[PDB]
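Whiteboard transcription, Tuesday session. T.W. wrote the C-alpha cells on the left side:
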C-alpha cells in the first residue's frame, strides 16, 4: 500500500 494504513484510504492493500 502507500504507507501502513491497510484501510481503503491508502492505496487499498495492506502495508
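and on the right, the sequence the group agreed on:
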Amino acid at each position: 500500500c502507500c504507507t501502513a494504513l491497510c484501510s481503503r484510504y491508502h492505496c487499498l492493500p495492506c502495508c
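Someone added at the bottom: The chain has no helices and no strands.
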